[PDB]
């Protein structure tokens, strides 16, 4: 069970697509719960689920849509270990694709520094790149970066 997020400009927000070993397929909204979404953000290294958006808000998914329904405890590391329950085929359509917005949305990089690990801090927000202010920037911030 390999999940991924597509169709989103935000780094940790997009439409849910689960790979069943070889094929990529979308997930219907009625088959996704809060516990399953929390596992998906954790597996994708995005931290915490913020919202669950149905109706193909992030992007009209293509390909097949699986009728598998996730019955998730909530503490599973991956979607693969989470028990699921099959359903009769053809239950859901394309217009009800599930979307997930996780927490880790900020993107920061270091540029123009000769070393890849050293450089001025640049942060992208509202569709533009810019340089972070030095004021109130200290060693604790630097270590996390």
């Amino acid at each position: 069970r390999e999940p991924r997020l597509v169709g989103g400009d935000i780094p940790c927000s997009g439409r849910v697509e689960v790979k069943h070993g070889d094929t990529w397929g979308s997930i219907c909204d009625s088959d996704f719960s809060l516990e399953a979404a929390s596992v998906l953000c954790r597996e994708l290294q995005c931290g915490t689920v913020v919202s669950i958006l149905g109706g193909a808000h992030f992007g009209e998914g293509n390909g097949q849509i699986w009728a598998e329904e996730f019955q998730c405890e909530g503490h599973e590391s991956h979607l693969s270990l989470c028990p699921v329950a099959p359903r009769p085929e053809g239950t859901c359509s394309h217009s009800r694709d599930v979307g997930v917005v996780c927490s880790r949305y900020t993107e920061i990089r270091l540029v123009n520094g000769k070393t890849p690990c050293e450089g001025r801090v640049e942060l992208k927000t509202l569709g533009a790149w810019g340089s972070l202010c030095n004021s109130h920037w200290d060693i604790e911030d630097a270590h996390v970066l």
Binding site: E69, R87, P88
Partner: protein, 145 residues
Amino acid sequence: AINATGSAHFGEGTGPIWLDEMKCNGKESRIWQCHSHGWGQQNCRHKEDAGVICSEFMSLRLTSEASREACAGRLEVFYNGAWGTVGKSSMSETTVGVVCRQLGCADKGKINPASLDKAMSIPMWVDNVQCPKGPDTLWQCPSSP
């Protein structure tokens, strides 16, 4: 069958659910042969349970003007989804006692003549009831067909 009871009306079962969405033509001899989603596959819970009321389900009560159930009144028996009276022929003291003890009114009892008012003039289901010594319930006493 006369009724198919749902929503755990009869009771709540603790065992795991074995079948889901049973579709049967009604003529198959064994319950297994009917179509289902899969053996041991389910999406319900224990709160949903299936009950059945068969044709030969018998209950006993006394009908009176004041109350539907009373310690004195007309004797009624329930069979094949219908209520029926019982004839007075071959009536015995032991049979009267067994009727009273089954419904928890008294130990012995007595037969009073017919009252002035009778409800709906329901038919007779059984006649010539002869009760031996020993059976607490009326179902064990021989009678006419």
